[PDB]
């Protein structure tokens with residue numbers, strides 16, 4: 001809940017797999033919630049904001065991803081919260097698409 | 104008194120690398136209009152390279168040790184330690200002494216051309232950060248409680264592997 005005030009920009013191809021999966025999740029969560037048809041393409045850029053506490057610190061991902069909407073490639077901004085208190089797959093881990101907006 | 108000492112920088116920043124990794128060492132020192140050469144030292148010995156950055160395509164154990172550099176307008180740098188390890192898995196860091204409030208950037212690196220999944224970072228034998236794939240562990244603000252022995256753990260291919268431990272101290 002309480003995050004560090006700094007927001008780190010993720011250099012090119014750092015955490016690419018974790019980030020590319022969180023992007024797909026974000027799209028899938030958007031399509032499920034708004035019954036949309038967006039098709040993921042790639043992550044453009046990513047930022048990370050880290051939780052304050054010592055153990056199992058959550059991360060807040062600010063993702064800029066490209067998705068196809070009826071063939072039209074468009075940019076979107078995804079905000080995803082991830083707090084893993086145990087090694088996945090476990091139901092104690094939380095993953096939530098908090099915001100999904102176009103650009 | 105205060106001299107303009109050159110500064111060796113690693114690219115990537117990891118001072119612990121696995122064999123076969125690429126490592127670039129850059130000299131942060133100003134050139135003169137006539138002398139744009141760089142003096143590179145390895146274990147107090149002057150090596151042949153005189154370029155801005157000393158490139159290591161595939162690191163070997165012989166590449167470990169201390170490195171220093173110097174340019175025309177700077178002074179012989181302090182030494183930077185490079186450790187080359189051989190293992191399936193490795194916990195990487197830019198250094199092992201961090202000032203309080205500085206960021207601690209850790210990376211779990213698997214042997215050349217191996218997949219790493221379900222990475223866990225542990226401090227003093229306790230799980231601290233769990234990932235599904237292989238993400239770096241970034242701690243933006245180091246504190247006194249961040250000191251300890253660290254290692255990372257994951258699946259290298261299909262083998263569950265734990266890396267060697269690394270001590271990290273925080274100075275107040």
Ligand SMILES: *[C@@H]1O[C@H](CO)[C@@H](O)[C@H](O)[C@H]1NC(C)=O
Pocket residue numbers: 145146164165166167168169
């Ligand atoms: C440099 O010194 C380190 C530490 O003693 C050693 O491991 C390495 O083999 C040395 N390399 C050369 C080229 O002398």
Ligand SMILES: *[C@@H]1O[C@H](CO)[C@@H](O)[C@H](O)[C@H]1NC(C)=O
Pocket residue numbers: 135137138173174175176
């Ligand atoms: C810098 O250049 C001058 C003349 O160009 C030379 O005399 C001097 O030795 C050089 N210093 C270094 C550290 O290369």
Ligand SMILES: *[C@@H]1O[C@H](CO)[C@@H](O)[C@H](O)[C@H]1NC(C)=O
Pocket residue numbers: 252268269270
């Ligand atoms: C960490 O430092 C302690 C000294 O407090 C030492 O006994 C131990 O062997 C060190 N461990 C590693 C992995 O360097």
Ligand SMILES: [Cl-]
Pocket residue numbers: 208
């Ligand atoms: Cl960094």
